[PDB]
Design a protein around this ligand. Structure first.
Ligand SMILES: O=C(O)/C=C/c1ccc(NC(=O)C2(NC(=O)c3ccc4c(C5CCCCC5)c5n(c4c3)CC(=O)Nc3ccccc3-5)CCCC2)cc1
Length: 541
């Protein structure tokens, strides 16, 4: 079947990516899928199902599901918004209960979805190509989204880890991800690793893939209504349905993965894992270790030789193609762990204050800096700079540029204590910047404040990026951080801790740094459990 069918009605509005480029994306994501399954696929599936069998999932109440709704989640077309949902307003609640009742009674009628072009900031690079088309987002109404949580929130939070174990990427903090990859690399006699990039993964997801995914969810111990709701949501929403633009016009139909449903991340991880594990067997890759985050796949295995490794990747690719997961860029074997870019990141190493080696995750800073520049220029709902400070806290660029720039703005605006929204693995977190030292200590360890001896390649990538973007050099940032640090120190409490810990790299004579006592009190239990991209998930912490 066709991933999409279109009426010709435009994807209407609600460098930055806009609805103008939607037509270019539509051409790429629109194709017929030809999927051929074999015994390797069937074997891996049965193994996954046996692990899913151990899961017991709870049905969330309306109230618990309402509490997970982001405050700025798109309003319902039925006369209520995200604020009404969170406040448990009679109208919102009554509508949610009728949506739920309808899921239990109607097992066939397709549910309507809205299609929108996503507005994302990318860097204006005229040397290696041109502007990227806007990504497309497909999501059901707010009432349906609350119902999805009731039936599947506990499933999507618990099941992926039970099924995939250590291969489930979203259970890891950046430090644990680094440790997993380093351990996997070290465990091989002669390691070889590769990233597998699927061309438009969401469009490659077939109706059968979605039913196979349900077959895995159905192995859980579930309440009868949860079981019916999962069955109904699969047929009416997950497998496909009609697409409506922002103007309420019929845009066409979808027969592939919707990017804005609760099961997107979980389903994509399960599907990518299933296909990859089966393709590993077809390719005869030896002693495979996989790390899967949605459509992002990394494989670490035993090298069989240079030519043999090239042949085994072509074989893996041919198998993924048969399973309807063809490649964007063909995979390349790597013989150094640092050379693998997975989840847009690479492993790097630094030294702590005692000279001990510390592995950390980094990435090219172009996109994070350009997005930070967009956010500094215009008020945004999500602060990517805050997410990048949290996730890339040990990096040279996040410490010297992002922390220095944003802490000077927060000092000037006197908004250090004001909670900000940021995204962590697709979920929305409301965070006070004053809590950053505690968060960083918990996710990366005390050493994240004392790291030095950065690699020449990492130093050069940062410095070249600053030049290209017209950002002042690192020496200017050191000078700026000293003033930012001094002002934070003068304020006391958490503000002084931000100065002392985040800006210890800036001082002539570096301070001792003892663990932050209150850091253990932060409840980070919901943090690196699961991925919720497009899942409409929220938490205050
Ligand atoms: O001695 C030497 O060798 C050179 C010294 C030197 C060179 C340049 C400056 N720049 C400045 O003073 C100003 N900009 C900045 O002090 C500045 C700060 C952050 C900037 C950012 C980001 C960095 C990440 C957080 C958000 C802001 C960008 N750009 C920035 C410029 C350059 C810019 O203007 N825009 C972009 C565009 C894309 C990406 C980054 C940038 C402020 C007044 C006039 C311009 C200062 C000192």
């Amino acid at each position: 079947s066709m991933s999409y069918t279109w009426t010709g009605a435009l994807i209407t509005p609600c460098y930055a990516t806009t609805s103008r480029s939607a037509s270019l994306r539509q051409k790429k994501v629109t194709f017929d899928r030809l999927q051929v399954l074999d015994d390797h696929y069937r074997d891996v599936l049965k193994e996954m199902k046996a692990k899913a069998s151990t899961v017991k999932a709870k049905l969330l109440s309306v109230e618990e599901a309402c509490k997970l709704t982001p405050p700025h989640s798109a309003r319902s077309k039925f006369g209520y918004g995200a604020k009404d949902v969170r406040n448990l307003s009679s109208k919102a609640v009554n509508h949610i209960r009728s949506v739920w009742k309808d899921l239990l009674e109607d097992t066939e009628t397709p549910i309507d979805t809205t299609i929108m072009a996503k507005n994302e900031v990318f860097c204006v690079q005229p040397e290696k190509g041109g502007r990227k088309p806007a990504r497309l987002i497909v999501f059901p109404d707010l009432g349906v989204r609350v119902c999805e949580k009731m039936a599947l929130y506990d499933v999507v939070s618990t099941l992926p880890q039970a099924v995939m174990g250590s291969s489930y990427g979203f259970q890891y903090s950046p430090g644990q991800r680094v440790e997993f990859l380093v351990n996997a690399w070290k465990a091989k006699k002669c390691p070889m690793g590769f990233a597998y990039d699927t061309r438009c993964f969401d469009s490659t997801v077939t109706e059968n893939d979605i039913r196979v995914e349900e077959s895995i969810y159905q192995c859980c111990d579930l309440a009868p209504e949860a079981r019916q709701a999962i069955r109904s949501l699969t047929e009416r929403l997950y497998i496909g349905g009609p697409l409506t633009n922002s103007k309420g016009q019929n845009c066409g139909y979808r027969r592939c993965r919707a990017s804005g449903v609760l099961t997107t991340s979980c389903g994509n991880t399960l599907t990518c894992y299933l296909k990859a594990a089966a393709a590993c067997r077809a390719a005869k890759l030896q002693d495979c270790t996989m790390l899967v985050c949605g459509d992002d796949l990394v494989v670490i295995c035993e090298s069989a030789g240079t030519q043999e490794d090239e042949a085994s990747l072509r074989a893996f690719t041919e198998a993924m193609t048969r399973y309807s997961a063809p490649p964007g860029d063909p995979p390349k074997p790597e013989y150094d762990l640092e050379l693998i870019t997975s989840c847009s990141s690479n492993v790097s190493v630094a030294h702590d204050a005692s000279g001990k080696r510390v592995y950390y995750l980094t990435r090219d800073p172009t996109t994070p800096l350009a997005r930070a520049a967009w956010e500094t220029a215009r008020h945004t709902p999500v602060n990517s700079w805050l997410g990048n400070i949290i996730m890339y806290a040990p990096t040279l660029w996040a410490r010297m540029i992002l922390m220095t720039h944003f802490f000077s703005i927060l000092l000037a605006q006197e908004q250090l204590e004001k909670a900000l929204d940021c995204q962590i693995y697709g979920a929305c977190y409301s965070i006070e910047p004053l809590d950053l030292p505690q968060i960083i200590q918990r996710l990366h360890g005390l050493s994240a404040f004392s790291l030095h001896s950065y690699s020449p390649g990492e130093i050069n990538r940062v410095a070249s990026c600053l030049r290209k973007l017209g950002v002042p050099p690192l020496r200017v940032w050191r000078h700026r951080a000293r003033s930012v640090r001094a002002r934070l120190l003068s304020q006391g409490g958490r503000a002084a801790t931000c100065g002392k810990y985040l800006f210890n790299w800036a001082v002539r004579t570096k301070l001792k740094l003892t663990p932050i006592p209150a850091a253990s009190q932060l409840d980070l239990s919901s943090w690196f459990v699961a991925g919720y991209s497009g899942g409409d998930i929220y938490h205050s912490l």
